[model samples]
Target: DLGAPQNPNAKAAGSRKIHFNWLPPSGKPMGYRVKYWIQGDSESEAHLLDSKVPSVELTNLYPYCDYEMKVCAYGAQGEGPYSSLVSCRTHQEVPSEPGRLAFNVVSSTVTQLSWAEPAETNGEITAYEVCYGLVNDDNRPIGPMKKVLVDNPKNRMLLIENLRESQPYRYTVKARNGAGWGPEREAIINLATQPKRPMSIPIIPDIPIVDAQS
Candidate 1:
């Protein structure tokens, strides 16, 4: 008889990449094979992989479906008994529906572009590519299309600089990861750059006014 089975290893997939890890075996085992089966609206149906290496990576699986997995040992004789079963659900995709992307007019030559973080965050977003140009003015693109690279995965802030003053600039933002750039998310506002001028309120003097009675 075989000992208790090891914990089932599961991984999540997004942007065509899958990630999963397994627990160490209970008793001395030469090699391990991982078998997985998806049910309730899934694509992978009873897929198996040799994980004697202790890890399994399944690709091209359906999103938002629960999958059941089990591990079995491969002894000197041959394939041994299977282990206890475990289950995990994969997160669903965002349906390619880009959210509302907007930008804040900072100054005469700078704008702050931001967008809502992706609803599903199974992957890391590395940089942002912002493309903007004049509607009727028809001039060369400013700032070479603005590539903003960030270390953190959840960065949604982008500062666009060197913009023309008081110009109606059409802008769009797209997210990028190790895989590639996501769909382009357009903004509602035209992202017009502010004019070069000081604040409306004038500076008030600190001198006290003399009263008529004094």
Candidate 2:
């Protein structure tokens, strides 16, 4: 009888592909069958490979998702038992662009910036980069650009200091995952200083009340 394939293993090939290999069983099996499914699914998809082929590359899988796979040998007698299931997770890719970038004027020389996370994380976001540059009227860079790296993925805010009052700045935010940085999304705003408060309370004039009485 065709014996079960043994020592099945899987490796991530890319963001959407996985490479699998197994030891052939002790028989002149006509072919092999590879079955795979996303973790937690009850059903699996199957692929047929020639007897000489000891490995297969599965593609079009969900990115950054875990999957289970198994392999079996078959011959004219019948199909043999499958190898023990093996698990693998596909590699991550750059996440989607950051969104909803906006800034808050904190002081004459300081500003607070915040943004929403990308809609599709693709994988765990590891960090972010905030880049800013002074721009001319045509929105072209006029001076040197600066960047701040946020190492903490949970932190979505950055405090920018030492900004010139009433100067227009163009800003862009980019997200990074295990794969690399994603495309950047940009926003522009004029830096504003904190409004000055009145030194003393204003007094209402009394002449209007006297005219109404007369």
Candidate 3:
């Protein structure tokens, strides 16, 4: 019995792999052939795979490529009419964008830091690198020097230790992908370390307290 053909069902494993499957024709047929084309001005068509089974995996596809796939059934007779076209957009690796960055002076020897979540992350962020140093201080980095991997979703704060008291510091943050590090986001303030408390109180050695002339 003749029936309308169906388009292939497509699924993406990651940014690189694409998997597709289709329902076999209701009636017996010799085999099936699948052909797909990346949708664009080029519009080139290539046969992905042909088999008695109803599923196939397509490889070597670039991330974020728009694609269209169609299936055709074949028997002793020439190839049958092509099935309806199935269109899909390969999931793009989310473009890396800088996150909200902020810094705070915690104490004489430490500084507290935190930032807002990046909205455009396609996958889990592996680590957030916080870098800071004094501006134009050859003796010090251009900002503070600290790196922390924020594994927990809520762990947005970090403390940078070993900071010198009363020194000015600048801060910046960057995110890492398997590809490489993204652009750096600079903080607004040049963070200054809190001043250390005075160690000793000055007083005259011979000074004595006289109350009511005892």
User: Highest lDDT: which candidate?
Assistant: 2
What would the per-residue lDDT of candidate 2 be over residues 125-211, giving only the tens digit for each residue?
988887888887788898677766444545777767676667778888989888889999898777663453222223754211111
lDDT of model 2 at position 109:
56
Cα shift from native, residue 169, model 1 (Å): 1.7
TM-score of each: 0.42, 0.70, 0.45
- On TM-score, the stronger of 1 and 2 is 2
| Count of backbone clashes, every candidate in sequence | 0, 0, 5
Q: Which lDDT tens digits does candidate 3 get at residues 124-203?
A: 56656665665555444653455444444235556566654556556677665444455667763433534333222247
Candidate 1: which pairs clash? none
Positional deviation of 25 in candidate 2, in angstroms?
Answer: 2.4
Worst-scoring 10-residue span by lDDT in model 3: 205-214
**Model 1 C-alpha RMSD to native:** 12.4
